[PDB]
Structure 1
Amino acid sequence: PPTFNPPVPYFGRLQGGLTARRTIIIKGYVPPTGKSFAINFKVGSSGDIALHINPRMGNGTVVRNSLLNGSWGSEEKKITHNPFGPGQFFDLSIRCGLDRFKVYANGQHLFDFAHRLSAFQRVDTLEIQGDVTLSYVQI
Structure 2
Amino acid sequence: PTFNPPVPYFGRLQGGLTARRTIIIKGYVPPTGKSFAINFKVGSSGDIALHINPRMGNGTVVRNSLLNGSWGSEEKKITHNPFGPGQFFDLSIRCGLDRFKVYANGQHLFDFAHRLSAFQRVDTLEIQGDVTLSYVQI
Any stretches of 5+ residues in structure 2 without a counterpart? none
Give the aligned partner of residue 37 of structure 2.
Answer: 38
Using the size of structure 1 for normalisation, the TM-score is 0.99
**Distance in 2 of aligned mates of 1:69 and 1:45:** 14
Q: How big is the shift at 1:76?
A: 0.1
Secondary structure, in 3 states, of the residue corresponding to 2:120? helix
1:92-132 superposed Cα distances (whole Å, 9 cap, x missing partner) = 00000000000000000000000000000000000000000
Q: How big is the shift at 1:45?
A: 1.1
**Distance in 2 of aligned mates of 1:10 and 1:50:** 17
**Distance in 2 of aligned mates of 1:39 and 1:60:** 16
1:14-68 superposed Cα distances (whole Å, 9 cap, x missing partner) = 0000000000000000000000000000001110000000000000000000000
**Distance in 1 of aligned mates of 2:7 and 2:38:** 11
Query: Which consecutive aligned stretches of 4+ in structure 1 deviate over 3 angstroms post-superposition?
Result: none
Secondary structure, in 3 states, of the residue corresponding to 2:78? coil
Secondary structure, in 3 states, of the residue corresponding to 2:90? strand
Any stretches of 5+ residues in structure 1 without a counterpart? none
**Distance in 1 of aligned mates of 2:61 and 2:93:** 15
Matched length = 138
1:100 aligns with 2:102: no
**Distance in 2 of aligned mates of 1:92 and 1:77:** 17
**Distance in 2 of aligned mates of 1:73 and 1:122:** 19
Secondary structure, in 3 states, of the residue corresponding to 2:115? coil
Using the size of structure 2 for normalisation, the TM-score is 1.00
